[PDB]
């Protein structure tokens, strides 16, 4: 219903150690930096870019530890105080309850891929219907050409 609470990415409640990723371009672009509204490091999480439209092998993983309801997600690019250009034009959500068995989130219609950002600055809020029940959430940047992506995220929902 109305459980759109920030789960801890910008606030710091989800600590650094709980945020992992496939790869990182630099230490300053590490997974931990992919927190919504953060300007620390080089401004976001950036993998050893670019993301290949055919091989979507890159991801940002958040470990929530307990089982949550994820009703909404929020994404941003690498604003880096107006000097950054990068963002994910699209992404897909993968999720696990045990960290072993991964489920691709799919809309009521059946589409996997969600529309991402249009710039590195503005937060884009994408609702999740059906809502996700997970302990682990993965954000996979999705593209149409080999482009450099960067992300800052936030998960919204409540605990079980």
């Amino acid at each position, epitope marked *: 219903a109305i459980c759109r609470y920030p789960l801890g990415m910008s606030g710091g409640q989800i600590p650094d150690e709980d945020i992992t990723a496939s790869s990182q371009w630099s230490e300053s672009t590490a997974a931990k930096y992919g927190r919504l509204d953060s300007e620390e490091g080089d401004g976001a999480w950036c993998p050893e870019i670019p993301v290949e439209p055919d091989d979507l092998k890159e991801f940002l993983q958040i470990d929530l530890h307990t089982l949550h309801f994820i009703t909404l997600v929020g994404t941003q690019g690498r604003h880096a105080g107006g000097h950054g250009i990068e963002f994910a034009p699209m992404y897909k959500i993968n999720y696990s309850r045990d960290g072993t068995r991964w489920i691709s989130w799919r809309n009521r219609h059946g589409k996997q891929v969600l529309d991402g950002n249009s*710039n590195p600055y503005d937060i884009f809020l994408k609702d999740l219907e059906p809502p996700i029940v997970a302990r682990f959430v993965r954000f996979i940047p999705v593209t149409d050409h080999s482009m450099n992506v960067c992300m800052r995220v936030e998960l919204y929902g409540c605990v079980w």
Partner: nanobody
Amino acid sequence: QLQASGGGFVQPGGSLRLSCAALDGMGWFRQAPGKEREFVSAISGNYASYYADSVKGRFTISRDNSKNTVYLQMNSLRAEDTATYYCAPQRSIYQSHKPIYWGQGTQVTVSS
């Protein structure tokens, strides 16, 4: 290095258009006296335009390719908008660690 111009004194509620010329990634920044440089707006290169929450709706950015100059129409100007305005080229992470050399920036005073 880019050069900004077109500033001056304006009454609250007023309007002003700033100019900039010497480069796809391009941004508008301002320095209020006693404050650090902050982002105001940027035009990417499907040309995507974005504005700081503090200037959303009130300000507009547009790139001229017949004059190789980017403009910033600042409508409904309030006191808070008093600063020295600048423009600089945006960079990819691959160029993030390269020094920034700013250039000329015009004074904009929004007083009654």
